Amino acid sequence: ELTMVFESFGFKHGIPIDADYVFDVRFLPNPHWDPKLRPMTGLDKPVAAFLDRHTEVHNFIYQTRSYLELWLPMLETNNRSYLTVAIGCTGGKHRSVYIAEQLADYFRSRGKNVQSRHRTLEK
Amino acid sequence: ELTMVFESFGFKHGIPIDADYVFDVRFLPNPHWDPKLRPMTGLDKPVAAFLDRHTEVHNFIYQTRSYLELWLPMLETNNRSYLTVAIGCTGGKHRSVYIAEQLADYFRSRGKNVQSRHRTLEK
Protein backbone atom coordinates (compact mmCIF):
# COMPACT_ATOMS: atom_id res chain seq x y z
CA GLU A 1 0.00 0.00 0.00
CA LEU A 2 0.90 3.66 -0.42
CA THR A 3 3.07 4.84 2.49
CA MET A 4 2.16 8.35 3.70
CA VAL A 5 5.24 10.13 5.02
CA PHE A 6 4.74 13.28 7.15
CA GLU A 7 7.91 15.27 7.60
CA SER A 8 8.69 18.57 9.28
CA PHE A 9 11.51 20.82 8.17
CA GLY A 10 12.86 24.35 8.42
CA PHE A 11 12.79 26.48 5.27
CA LYS A 12 16.15 27.85 6.44
CA HIS A 13 17.59 24.38 5.70
CA GLY A 14 15.83 23.95 2.35
CA ILE A 15 12.85 21.94 1.16
CA PRO A 16 13.34 18.17 1.57
CA ILE A 17 14.10 16.55 -1.76
CA ASP A 18 11.64 13.71 -1.21
CA ALA A 19 8.62 16.00 -0.78
CA ASP A 20 5.55 15.65 -3.03
CA TYR A 21 3.43 18.24 -1.21
CA VAL A 22 4.84 21.14 0.78
CA PHE A 23 2.74 23.24 3.16
CA ASP A 24 4.10 26.44 4.67
CA VAL A 25 2.90 27.05 8.26
CA ARG A 26 4.88 30.26 8.93
CA PHE A 27 1.56 32.15 9.22
CA LEU A 28 0.49 30.18 12.31
CA PRO A 29 1.12 31.54 15.83
CA ASN A 30 4.84 31.74 16.42
CA PRO A 31 6.27 30.57 19.77
CA HIS A 32 9.71 32.00 18.95
CA TRP A 33 9.55 34.88 21.42
CA ASP A 34 8.31 33.01 24.49
CA PRO A 35 11.72 32.14 25.97
CA LYS A 36 10.38 29.09 27.79
CA LEU A 37 9.15 27.57 24.50
CA ARG A 38 12.18 28.42 22.33
CA PRO A 39 14.35 25.48 23.53
CA MET A 40 11.39 23.06 23.37
CA THR A 41 10.02 21.31 20.29
CA GLY A 42 6.59 20.67 18.85
CA LEU A 43 6.70 17.23 20.47
CA ASP A 44 6.53 18.93 23.88
CA LYS A 45 3.27 19.60 25.67
CA PRO A 46 3.80 23.34 26.30
CA VAL A 47 4.41 23.96 22.62
CA ALA A 48 1.42 21.86 21.56
CA ALA A 49 -0.74 23.79 24.06
CA PHE A 50 0.58 27.17 22.80
CA LEU A 51 -0.45 26.19 19.27
CA ASP A 52 -3.73 24.48 20.03
CA ARG A 53 -5.16 27.48 21.92
CA HIS A 54 -5.50 29.19 18.52
CA THR A 55 -8.48 28.17 16.39
CA GLU A 56 -6.53 28.38 13.15
CA VAL A 57 -4.17 25.60 14.21
CA HIS A 58 -6.86 22.95 14.48
CA ASN A 59 -8.48 24.38 11.36
CA PHE A 60 -5.19 24.09 9.43
CA ILE A 61 -4.88 20.41 10.42
CA TYR A 62 -8.51 19.64 9.60
CA GLN A 63 -8.50 21.51 6.30
CA THR A 64 -5.16 20.08 5.21
CA ARG A 65 -6.13 16.48 5.86
CA SER A 66 -9.44 17.13 4.08
CA TYR A 67 -7.64 18.56 1.05
CA LEU A 68 -5.29 15.58 0.93
CA GLU A 69 -8.28 13.20 1.18
CA LEU A 70 -9.66 14.60 -2.09
CA TRP A 71 -6.69 13.15 -3.99
CA LEU A 72 -5.72 10.16 -1.90
CA PRO A 73 -7.82 7.63 -3.86
CA MET A 74 -6.11 8.67 -7.10
CA LEU A 75 -2.69 8.81 -5.42
CA GLU A 76 -3.07 5.34 -3.86
CA THR A 77 -3.15 4.18 -7.48
CA ASN A 78 -0.50 6.39 -9.19
CA ASN A 79 2.23 3.74 -9.62
CA ARG A 80 3.36 5.17 -6.33
CA SER A 81 5.03 3.78 -3.24
CA TYR A 82 5.09 7.02 -1.24
CA LEU A 83 3.10 10.17 -0.74
CA THR A 84 5.37 12.56 1.15
CA VAL A 85 3.85 15.62 2.83
CA ALA A 86 6.37 18.13 4.10
CA ILE A 87 5.37 20.80 6.62
CA GLY A 88 7.73 23.77 6.85
CA CYS A 89 8.34 26.53 9.34
CA THR A 90 11.49 28.63 9.53
CA GLY A 91 13.60 26.44 11.79
CA GLY A 92 11.69 23.17 11.79
CA LYS A 93 11.45 22.89 15.59
CA HIS A 94 7.99 24.07 16.70
CA ARG A 95 5.05 24.73 14.34
CA SER A 96 6.01 22.28 11.60
CA VAL A 97 6.84 19.49 14.06
CA TYR A 98 3.45 19.81 15.78
CA ILE A 99 1.46 19.97 12.56
CA ALA A 100 3.28 17.00 10.98
CA GLU A 101 2.62 14.99 14.15
CA GLN A 102 -1.08 15.81 14.11
CA LEU A 103 -1.46 14.93 10.43
CA ALA A 104 0.40 11.65 10.91
CA ASP A 105 -1.80 10.73 13.90
CA TYR A 106 -4.95 11.56 11.92
CA PHE A 107 -4.05 9.33 8.95
CA ARG A 108 -2.86 6.54 11.28
CA SER A 109 -6.34 6.74 12.86
CA ARG A 110 -7.86 6.18 9.41
CA GLY A 111 -5.93 2.94 9.01
CA LYS A 112 -3.40 4.34 6.52
CA ASN A 113 0.21 3.23 6.35
CA VAL A 114 2.15 6.17 7.81
CA GLN A 115 5.56 7.28 8.97
CA SER A 116 6.76 10.59 10.48
CA ARG A 117 10.12 12.28 10.34
CA HIS A 118 11.42 15.55 11.85
CA ARG A 119 14.33 16.75 9.73
CA THR A 120 15.64 19.35 12.22
CA LEU A 121 15.10 17.31 15.35
CA GLU A 122 16.93 14.30 13.93
CA LYS A 123 20.11 16.42 13.79
CA GLU B 1 0.62 43.94 -1.41
CA LEU B 2 1.47 40.25 -1.28
CA THR B 3 2.57 39.00 -4.71
CA MET B 4 1.19 35.54 -5.55
CA VAL B 5 3.63 33.65 -7.76
CA PHE B 6 2.37 30.54 -9.60
CA GLU B 7 5.17 28.43 -11.02
CA SER B 8 5.25 25.12 -12.84
CA PHE B 9 8.19 22.75 -12.66
CA GLY B 10 9.26 19.18 -13.29
CA PHE B 11 10.11 17.04 -10.27
CA LYS B 12 12.87 15.55 -12.43
CA HIS B 13 14.60 18.95 -12.20
CA GLY B 14 14.01 19.43 -8.46
CA ILE B 15 11.62 21.54 -6.41
CA PRO B 16 12.10 25.29 -6.98
CA ILE B 17 13.93 26.86 -4.07
CA ASP B 18 11.53 29.80 -3.83
CA ALA B 19 8.45 27.63 -3.28
CA ASP B 20 6.25 28.08 -0.18
CA TYR B 21 3.57 25.58 -1.23
CA VAL B 22 4.17 22.64 -3.54
CA PHE B 23 1.36 20.63 -5.13
CA ASP B 24 2.05 17.39 -6.97
CA VAL B 25 -0.24 16.86 -9.99
CA ARG B 26 1.31 13.57 -11.23
CA PHE B 27 -2.00 11.81 -10.46
CA LEU B 28 -3.92 13.84 -13.07
CA PRO B 29 -4.47 12.48 -16.60
CA ASN B 30 -1.14 12.14 -18.33
CA PRO B 31 -0.79 13.28 -21.97
CA HIS B 32 2.68 11.72 -22.25
CA TRP B 33 1.65 8.86 -24.53
CA ASP B 34 -0.43 10.79 -27.07
CA PRO B 35 2.37 11.55 -29.55
CA LYS B 36 0.65 14.66 -30.88
CA LEU B 37 0.57 16.19 -27.38
CA ARG B 38 4.09 15.23 -26.26
CA PRO B 39 5.89 18.09 -28.10
CA MET B 40 3.22 20.61 -27.03
CA THR B 41 2.95 22.39 -23.69
CA GLY B 42 0.17 23.16 -21.25
CA LEU B 43 -0.09 26.60 -22.84
CA ASP B 44 -1.40 24.92 -26.02
CA LYS B 45 -5.08 24.39 -26.69
CA PRO B 46 -4.92 20.64 -27.43
CA VAL B 47 -3.20 19.97 -24.12
CA ALA B 48 -5.63 22.18 -22.19
CA ALA B 49 -8.54 20.34 -23.87
CA PHE B 50 -7.01 16.91 -23.07
CA LEU B 51 -6.84 17.90 -19.40
CA ASP B 52 -10.12 19.74 -19.10
CA ARG B 53 -12.19 16.81 -20.43
CA HIS B 54 -11.51 15.10 -17.09
CA THR B 55 -13.63 16.22 -14.14
CA GLU B 56 -10.78 15.91 -11.67
CA VAL B 57 -8.76 18.61 -13.43
CA HIS B 58 -11.30 21.36 -12.87
CA ASN B 59 -11.91 19.97 -9.39
CA PHE B 60 -8.17 20.13 -8.59
CA ILE B 61 -8.05 23.80 -9.65
CA TYR B 62 -11.20 24.69 -7.73
CA GLN B 63 -10.23 22.81 -4.59
CA THR B 64 -6.67 24.11 -4.61
CA ARG B 65 -7.66 27.75 -4.95
CA SER B 66 -10.26 27.20 -2.22
CA TYR B 67 -7.65 25.69 0.10
CA LEU B 68 -5.28 28.58 -0.54
CA GLU B 69 -8.10 31.08 0.15
CA LEU B 70 -8.43 29.71 3.70
CA TRP B 71 -4.96 31.03 4.56
CA LEU B 72 -4.59 34.00 2.25
CA PRO B 73 -5.87 36.60 4.76
CA MET B 74 -3.27 35.47 7.30
CA LEU B 75 -0.56 35.21 4.64
CA GLU B 76 -1.28 38.70 3.26
CA THR B 77 -0.17 39.84 6.71
CA ASN B 78 2.79 37.52 7.51
CA ASN B 79 5.62 40.06 7.04
CA ARG B 80 5.60 38.61 3.58
CA SER B 81 6.27 39.96 0.11
CA TYR B 82 5.58 36.73 -1.78
CA LEU B 83 3.42 33.66 -1.62
CA THR B 84 4.88 31.20 -4.11
CA VAL B 85 2.80 28.21 -5.21
CA ALA B 86 4.70 25.61 -7.20
CA ILE B 87 2.85 23.00 -9.26
CA GLY B 88 4.91 19.95 -10.19
CA CYS B 89 4.60 17.18 -12.74
CA THR B 90 7.45 14.96 -13.89
CA GLY B 91 8.82 17.08 -16.72
CA GLY B 92 7.14 20.42 -16.13
CA LYS B 93 5.73 20.73 -19.67
CA HIS B 94 2.05 19.69 -19.63
CA ARG B 95 -0.02 19.13 -16.46
CA SER B 96 1.84 21.53 -14.17
CA VAL B 97 1.96 24.30 -16.79
CA TYR B 98 -1.81 24.12 -17.35
CA ILE B 99 -2.69 24.01 -13.67
CA ALA B 100 -0.35 26.90 -12.76
CA GLU B 101 -1.90 28.95 -15.58
CA GLN B 102 -5.43 28.28 -14.37
CA LEU B 103 -4.60 29.14 -10.76
CA ALA B 104 -2.86 32.36 -11.82
CA ASP B 105 -5.85 33.38 -13.97
CA TYR B 106 -8.25 32.65 -11.10
CA PHE B 107 -6.39 34.82 -8.58
CA ARG B 108 -5.87 37.58 -11.18
CA SER B 109 -9.69 37.53 -11.59
CA ARG B 110 -10.02 38.12 -7.83
CA GLY B 111 -7.94 41.29 -8.08
CA LYS B 112 -4.81 39.77 -6.50
CA ASN B 113 -1.29 40.75 -7.48
CA VAL B 114 -0.03 37.75 -9.46
CA GLN B 115 2.81 36.51 -11.63
CA SER B 116 3.35 33.17 -13.42
CA ARG B 117 6.52 31.36 -14.33
CA HIS B 118 7.15 28.05 -16.15
CA ARG B 119 10.53 26.73 -15.05
CA THR B 120 10.89 24.09 -17.80
CA LEU B 121 9.48 26.17 -20.62
CA GLU B 122 11.76 29.10 -19.87
CA LYS B 123 14.75 26.86 -20.72
Residue numbers in the entry:
A (entry chain A), B (entry chain A): 159 to 281
What does the literature reporting this entry say, word for word?
Well-ordered crystals were obtained of the purified RapZ-CTD, and a native dataset from a single crystal was collected at 1.17 Å resolution. Overall, the electron density was readily interpretable and allowed residues 156–281 to be modelled. Of note are a cluster of basic residues around an extended loop on the surface of RapZ-CTD, including arginine 196 and lysines 251 and 281. During the process of modelling and refinement, clearly defined electron density for a non-protein ligand was observed in a pocket composed of the side chains of residues His190, His252, Arg253 and the backbone of Thr248 and Gly249. During optimization of the protein crystals, we found the addition of malonate to be extremely beneficial for crystal growth, and a malonate molecule accounts for this density excellently. RapZ-CTD unexpectedly exhibits distant structural homology to the fructose-6-phosphate binding domain of PFK, suggesting a common evolutionary origin.
RapZ contributes to the control of glucosamine phosphate biogenesis by selectively presenting the regulatory small RNA GlmZ to the essential ribonuclease RNase E for inactivation.
